[PDB]
Amino acid sequence: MSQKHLQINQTFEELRLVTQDTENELKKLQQTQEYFIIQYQESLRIQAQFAQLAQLSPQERLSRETALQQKQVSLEAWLQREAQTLQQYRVELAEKHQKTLQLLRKQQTIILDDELIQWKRRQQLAGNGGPPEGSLDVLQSWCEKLAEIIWQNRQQIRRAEHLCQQLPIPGPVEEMLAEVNATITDIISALVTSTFIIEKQPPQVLKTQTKFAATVRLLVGGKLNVHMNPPQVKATIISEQQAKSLLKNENTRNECSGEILNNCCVMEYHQATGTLSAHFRNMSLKRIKRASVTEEKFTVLFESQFSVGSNELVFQVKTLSLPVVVIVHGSQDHNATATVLWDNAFAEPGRVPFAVPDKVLWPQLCEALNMKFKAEVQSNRGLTKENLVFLAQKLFNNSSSHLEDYSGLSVSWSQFNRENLPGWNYTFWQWFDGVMEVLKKHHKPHWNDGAILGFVNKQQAHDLLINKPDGTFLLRFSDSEIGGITIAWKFDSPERNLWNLKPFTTRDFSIRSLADRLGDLSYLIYVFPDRPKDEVFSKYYTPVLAKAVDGYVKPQIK
Numbered sequence: 226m227s228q229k230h231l232q233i234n235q236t237f238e239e240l241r242l243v244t245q246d247t248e249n250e251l252k253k254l255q256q257t258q259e260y261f262i263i264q265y266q267e268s269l270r271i272q273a274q275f276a277q278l279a280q281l282s283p284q285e286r287l288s289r290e291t292a293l294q295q296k297q298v299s300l301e302a303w304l305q306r307e308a309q310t311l312q313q314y315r316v317e318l319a320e321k322h323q324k325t326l327q328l329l330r331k332q333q334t335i336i337l338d339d340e341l342i343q344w345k346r347r348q349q350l351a352g353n354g355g356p357p358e359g360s361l362d363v364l365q366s367w368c369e370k371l372a373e374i375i376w377q378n379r380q381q382i383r384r385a386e387h388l389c390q391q392l393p394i395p396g397p398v399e400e401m402l403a404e405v406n407a408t409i410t411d412i413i414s415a416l417v418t419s420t421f422i423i424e425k426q427p428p429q430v431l432k433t434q435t436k437f438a439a440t441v442r443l444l445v446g447g448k449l450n451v452h453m454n455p456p457q458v459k460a461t462i463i464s465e466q467q468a469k470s471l472l473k474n475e476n477t478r479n480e481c482s483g484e485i486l487n488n489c490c491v492m493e494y495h496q497a498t499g500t501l502s503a504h505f506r507n508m509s510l511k512r513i514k515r516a517s518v519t520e521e522k523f524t525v526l527f528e529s530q531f532s533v534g535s536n537e538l539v540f541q542v543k544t545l546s547l548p549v550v551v552i553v554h555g556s557q558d559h560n561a562t563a564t565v566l567w568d569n570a571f572a573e574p575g576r577v578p579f580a581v582p583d584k585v586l587w588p589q590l591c592e593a594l595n596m597k598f599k600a601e602v603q604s605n606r607g608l609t610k611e612n613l614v615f616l617a618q619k620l621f622n623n624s625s626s627h628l629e630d631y632s633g634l635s636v637s638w639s640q641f642n643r644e645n646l647p648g649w650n651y652t653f654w655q656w657f658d659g660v661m662e663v664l665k666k667h668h669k670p671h672w673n674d675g676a677i678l679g680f681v682n683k684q685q686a687h688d689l690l691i692n693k694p695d696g697t698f699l700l701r702f703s704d705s706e707i708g709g710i711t712i713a714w715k716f717d718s719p720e721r722n723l724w725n726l727k728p729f730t731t732r733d734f735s736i737r738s739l740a741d742r743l744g745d746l747s748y749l750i751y752v753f754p755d756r757p758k759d760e761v762f763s764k765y766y767t768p769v770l771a772k773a774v775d776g777y778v779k780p781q782i783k
């Protein structure tokens with residue numbers, strides 16, 4: 226276990242102990258108050274006995290009167306001392322409650338403002354291919370203890386308040402309790418609202434009329450008996466503007482930007498795991514309301530209303546999903562992805578709904594592109610420092626081959642996916658995404674195997690192959706054709722020594738695969754640097770299969 230995590234567990238055990246201590250004190254204080262009340266009635270009976278001396282022999286009366294006086298004077302003195310003891314125990318209990326609430330405040334800030342935020346950030350980067358955020362198991366186990374400890378303390382101070390109503394003692398206790406109560410309502414509000422979270426986000430590139438899912442959960446749901454009357458959670462699609470004003474409490478009526486089919490779900494309690502979660506499995510976007518379409522951000526607002534405890538402590542919880550870009554056609558998916566990638570990667574913590582920086586530094590963009598690239602190609606072979614130099618030369622229209630020279634250069638959103646690259650009809654994102662699309666669709670094994678060098682220009686291709694045996698070739702990414710793969714090969718000749726074949730695209734690869742095509746060209750012998758062609762591609766050569774129409778009753782490879 227981590228050291229930061231062990232300290233959290235140490236504090237939970239410390240908080241449990243001090244809450245037991247105030248429970249014991251409150252039981253002692255209830256006994257003192259009850260005994261004091263019996264003794265107060267004993268003082269009224271001394272008075273009643275004095276009135277019963279009216280019918281007594283004044284010789285015997287003298288004895289029974291001095292005795293009643295000695296009893297009254299001592300019981301009166303005891304009662305007065307006991308009254309200050311009751312006030313002192315009530316102050317020492319309020320001080321103890323104030324002390325544990327401050328330790329609980331520090332503990333809750335760690336759980337909610339750091340550990341939960343880290344998990345949410347991990348879930349946010351996972352949308353770009355980052356490593357999975359992991360189970361909410363730990364955050365739930367911690368939030369359960371926050372709920373259990375704040376509740377135990379609230380019911381202790383409700384019991385203390387009953388005692389004060391039963392026997393009021395004016396003084397500093399009344400304002401110490403008024404303060405402890407304010408601290409409790411803040412802790413409970415922050416805990417309830419902050420633990421209503423999306424476990425499984427909806428798709429960030431969302432086509433209308435397409436089934437989609439999301440999972441919301443209340444981390445403290447089982448501990449505060451919210452599972453008793455499981456609340457209905459409703460999902461609505463809202464705009465970036467509607468989200469901004471929603472958080473500033475300017476929601477006019479019930480603002481929304483479209484309709485979600487099957488947008489209602491009742492939370493389900495799972496006794497074994499203690500989890501209270503709404504699983505929306507069949508949501509669908511029926512319509513969307515507009516104001517680029519691929520730059521327009523929406524969010525799925527999940528809201529619910531429930532109360533904590535037998536009585537009415539009602540909470541209205543709201544949680545916004547990570548921004549979503551709504552497409553209708555499917556061809557819009559590529560540009561929508563850039564808007565999502567920029568948001569997921571560069572959102573500053575604590576931002577107002579969907580504010581992103583205009584510019585980032587080249588190494589920040591590199592981290593985002595490499596994370597996306599490996600998720601798309603499904604490989605651990607990502608963008609090397611050389612590949613980054615190639616993309617930096619392309620993006621900045623620079624000649625440097627030193628990655629360090631690009632360190633302090635900034636890429637704006639328009640430089641990434643608005644303005645086209647010099648002398649081209651496409652943006653840097655459209656070029657990079659075109660490479661990912663061609664690799665993902667047909668060449669995942671080839672990319673993983675090292676068979677596609679790709680991120681080299683014509684001059685780099687020339688200088689790598691110049692001193693290689695004839696038939697040495699590399700597969701490169703085409704500049705002129707988005708999603709294109711061109712063969713560069715060396716073969717000594719009078720005109721040129723290096724040659725670039727016409728690039729292939731997914732349409733060509735659907736008719737005949739890259740491996741089948743390379744296998745047909747007998748003049749391609751070595752895959753750069755010196756790997757025999759069949760060694761790298763033979764695994765993927767289509768074995769010619771005979772057909773049923775040609776008279777073959779059993780499958781046959783002809």
Ligand SMILES: CN(C)C(=O)CCN(C(=O)[C@@H]1CCCN1C(=O)[C@@H](NC(=O)c1cc2cc(C(F)(F)P(=O)(O)O)ccc2s1)C(C)(C)C)c1ccc(-c2nccs2)cc1
Pocket residue numbers: 702703704705706709710711724725726727728729730733745746
């Ligand atoms: C059939 N067979 C046995 C063969 O050997 C035929 C091979 N073949 C050829 O000869 C073809 C036939 C016509 C001339 N051809 C050429 O390739 C000639 N070259 C070129 O035409 C070009 C090279 C490049 C490179 C690029 C780039 F590198 F990608 P970029 O980064 O600037 O974008 C861009 C444009 C061109 S045009 C040449 C001879 C080699 C000079 C072959 C190549 C590709 C295709 C395609 N089919 C489906 C799509 S592309 C079919 C024919």
